Amino acid sequence: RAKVAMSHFEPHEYIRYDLLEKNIDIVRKRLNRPLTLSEKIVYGHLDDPANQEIERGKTYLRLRPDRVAMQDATAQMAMLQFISSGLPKVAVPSTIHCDHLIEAQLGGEKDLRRAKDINQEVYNFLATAGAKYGVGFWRPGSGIIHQIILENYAYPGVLLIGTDSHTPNGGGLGGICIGVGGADAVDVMAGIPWELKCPKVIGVKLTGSLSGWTSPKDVILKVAGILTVKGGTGAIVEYHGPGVDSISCTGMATICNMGAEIGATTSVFPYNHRMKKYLSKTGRADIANLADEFKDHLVPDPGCHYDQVIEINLSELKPHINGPFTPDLAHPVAEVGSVAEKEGWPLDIRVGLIGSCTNSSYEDMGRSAAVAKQALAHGLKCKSQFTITPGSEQIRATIERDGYAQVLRDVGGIVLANACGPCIGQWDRKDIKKGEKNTIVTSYNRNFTGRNDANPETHAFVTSPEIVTALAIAGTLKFNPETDFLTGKDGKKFKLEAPDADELPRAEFDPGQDTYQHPPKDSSGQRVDVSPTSQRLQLLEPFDKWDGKDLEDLQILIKVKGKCTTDHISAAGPWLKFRGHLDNISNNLLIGAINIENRKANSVRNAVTQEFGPVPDTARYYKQHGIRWVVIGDENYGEGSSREHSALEPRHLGGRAIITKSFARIHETNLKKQGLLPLTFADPADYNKIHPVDKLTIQGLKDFAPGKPLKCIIKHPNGTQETILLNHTFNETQIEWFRAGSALNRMKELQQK
Ligand code: SF4
Structure with missing residues (x-):
């Protein structure tokens, strides 16, 4: 077709809108109905468009992303898992962005210099693993991952995944950009199909135009108050309507970005002239020109069906x-x-x-x-x-x-x-x-x-x-x-006039200093060194395979009350120092969660000693003594950040299952990826039947199956038992991850030994 490169850094990787067109046409022949824009881009990236079962909210889609982006607080553990895979090179365009480890203290240049000194070990590990596996590296100081992606890598119709829950930012340039945990990025860098539960589509019709003090951020602050933090779960938010052309491209990126706070899989806007403009001012006029020739596939079909519509008058x-x-x-x-x-x-x-x-x-x-x-x-x-x-x-x-x-x-x-x-x-x-x-x-x-x-x-x-x-x-x-x-x-009262400013520089952008480092695509014989006494980096030891038995007499480590975010499960701030060291970061496990027994953060009863203590210490004690444990949570467990450490840490400290009223999407996928059982109550009132002192048996793991619930026997201290049912959303691909001990263990079995 046309040979237009995906970016300035990969002159040989071409945008495949021909492929997109071809796949959309196979799928719309099967479905015989209008497709939303998110359906066009997502189903246009299907691995098998002819045979894929497509039911919104119900089937798992096997997709082929175009590129992978990682930021340095999550790239460490994603690259340590990639190093266990034993694979020599990443299969798709991948980048690392060093933006999370620069502490604010002195401001600008001074803070950057200090972070380069303090974090040398980590930045060195990521640049070297980058050079070896063929991953582009944006050095500290380059910028926040999503701003670098919008400026250089996001274009209309791209399917991009990123190890960061605000990767939806790229929907501001018409692509489907989805937040994943490091083990999902590993699948794609390894070349195997990525699975995503087919999303519902919430359409938000924008009407009118913004004026005065109201800005793009108000649109998504209003949508979040309407939908609430769990209202977008399982859905893509698709903006449309006459008001769309009133918003700048980075304004659209702001609205798509914060869709993360309602649990949405991602958000997207249709290709329009503000996007074309931003592409031209960022050196990508040829990509705008090609998207103009494929414009039909980059806007929603007339009369497509949204599962929910919200209308906002700008x-x-x-x-x-x-x-x-x-x-x-x-x-x-x-x-x-x-x-x-x-x-x-x-x-x-x-x-x-x-x-x-x-x-x-x-x-x-x-x-x-x-x-x-x-x-x-x-x-x-x-x-x-x-x-x-x-x-x-x-x-x-x-x-x-x-x-x-x-x-x-x-x-x-x-x-x-x-x-x-x-x-x-x-x-x-x-x-x-x-x-x-x-x-x-x-x-x-x-x-x-x-x-x-x-x-x-x-x-x-x-x-x-x-x-x-x-x-x-x-x-x-x-x-x-x-x-x-x-x-x-001067003594006079005055009023602030509403701000007015240009959306883009009248002159061209000044690119600033050089910060990208291309992989030697020659050399690549770097040795990646991880010191065996490092406190910041540690190679992974594989998790245990499932033993073939049911889980009897599980101890409840903690029954959480209320909101339990991934910042409650694995805090950031000072703990970012250990994002490459599983044992050291496991010392923050669940220290922010409120225990229903006493309403305290980080104070649970050790069942053996009968002393109240920190949660990490109690989990290590149970692990040390062979006591398998469980977490019981409430609604929207795992809300927030995509950090897979919230799933790796309970697996490391001896956790077996997390039983909640509901899960946020990325955390539930990260939990299945690490060989844990994320289970929900078939009747949420059963959360009230389980007390901290009770022991649980999960039964029926031998014929674990898509769509069949698991029996949970609650053993009360007085000898009384009660059976309840627990649902799960595992398909047979995911049950293989569980049986193998983790997804990475399973991938290693498929490497013929
Ligand atoms: S939301 Fe996440 S990626 Fe964005 S600026 Fe904050 S920490 Fe960085």
């Missing part, structure tokens, strides 16, 4: 601020001042933080700068502390050039390295004592307990970058930028 949407400890507690900015007051949420804002992958684009920096120049024109500066993270080197170089960074420095902000930083708790915060109740407002996405600064009483609210700037200048939540007055230096 012209009536007002500025929102969500939180404090869930991203779906939504408030208009005009009322957060009074709800806070009523609820006892601290009103004075300590720190205002703009950035993260959700809101770090050129336009976000221009709109924040536009608020800040108005304050400056009245002789004001931020009352709160104010930090700014540019999403990539190209954006840092261009906002510097076009004057935005200096305005933001002059109102009192500190520009941080192009990295996650305070968003995953990589922040050396010292203005509050630990346990001090305080409020910070961010333009981030999650705001779970102790995620930004490990302080559980920090109240974090997420909003748009221009509203963080306005509230940082006022320093109080009781300020509405739309209505209220600030007092300048």
Whole structure:
């Protein structure tokens, strides 16, 4: 067909829209109905379009992704599992992005220099494993993974998977970009079909157009308050309607990004002229030209069916601020001042933080700068502390050039390295004592307990970058930028005009310094060295194969009450130091989860000793003594981040099964991948029949089968037993992972020995 390369770094890897077209046509012949846009891109990437059973919410699709992207907090364990596979080279375009391990402390260059010193061992391991297996490497300082992907790798119709739950960001350029755990990335780098449960499709019709202070972030802050954090589970969110053309390409990426907070498989927007424009300004006019010739396959079919439709009128949407400890507690900015007051949420804002992958684009920096120049024109500066993270080197170089960074420095902000930083708790915060109740407002996405600064009483609210700037200048939540007055230096009351800024640089982007490192596709005879006494890296020992028996008299390690996020199961911040060391990071296992017995975090009863202690220590004690254990959880267990450490750690410390009312998708897949049994109650009221003291037998593992429930015998202390039924969503591919001990063990059996 055309020979248009997938990116500037892979001149020989061509976009296959011909293949996409061919597969869409095979599938629509079978289904005889309109296809949504997500169905076109997803079913157009099927391994076997002619034979695949396609039922939304029901069948597992065997897909062929176009490329794999990893960031350095998850790439370590994905590459250690790739090293166990024994395979010589990755089968599809793959990149590593070093963005998670740069701690904010001093700002910019100083923080970057220090992270390069502190994290040398890790960055060295990833560059070397990258050179050897043929993975591209974006060096520290290059930018947050999703901003580098939008700028260089996402195009209309791509199917991309990434080891990070905010990989949906790339839906802002018309592709299907899905968050997975490191073991799923290994399947694709290994060349075997990736499986995904066929999604439902929620259509969101946008009407009207944005104006004034309302920005793209408000659309997804409103959708999250509507759907709630579990409302998107099992579905792709597909935006459509006349209002779509009112949003910039990075604005579309913001809305798709935070779809992660409602549990959605991903989100996507149809190819339009704002995307074409962004592709041309990022050096990819030939890809825009080819997508124009294939435009039919890059928009939804007329009259396609959504399983749920939501309609939002962009012209009536007002500025929102969500939180404090869930991203779906939504408030208009005009009322957060009074709800806070009523609820006892601290009103004075300590720190205002703009950035993260959700809101770090050129336009976000221009709109924040536009608020800040108005304050400056009245002789004001931020009352709160104010930090700014540019999403990539190209954006840092261009906002510097076009004057935005200096305005933001002059109102009192500190520009941080192009990295996650305070968003995953990589922040050396010292203005509050630990346990001090305080409020910070961010333009981030999650705001779970102790995620930004490990302080559980920090109240974090997420909003748009221009509203963080306005509230940082006022320093109080009781300020509405739309209505209220600030007092300048000169004694006059003045009002903030709504920010206006260009979506893209008028001139071209300044690319900044060189940060990509191509694999030697010649040499590749690197030895990857992992010191056997390293505290940060450790080669994996394979998990045990299933012994062929039922699981009798399992001890309950903990019965969790309430919300149990992957940040509750395997915290980040200081623990990021150990993301390549399974035994060392297992010391944070479930330390944030609330135990129903006492309502305490990290305090469970050891069954043998009858002493209450830390959860990691109690799991190690049971493991040491041969006691197999179980976790009993509530609804949406595993909400959040895709980090597979939340599944690897319970497997390492002797866990066998996790029985909940429901699971978030990526955690449930990670649990099956590591050879654990994720099971749900056939009747959620049975959660109330199980007490911490009871022992459980899971029965019927011998004829474990797709669609057949498992019998659980609850053994009460008084001799009383009760049988309940537990559902599972395993197909026969996944039952093989369980029988082998893990998915990686199974792949190694298929290597003929
Ligand atoms: S959500 Fe935060 S921690 Fe996760 S990739 Fe984005 S900026 Fe980094």
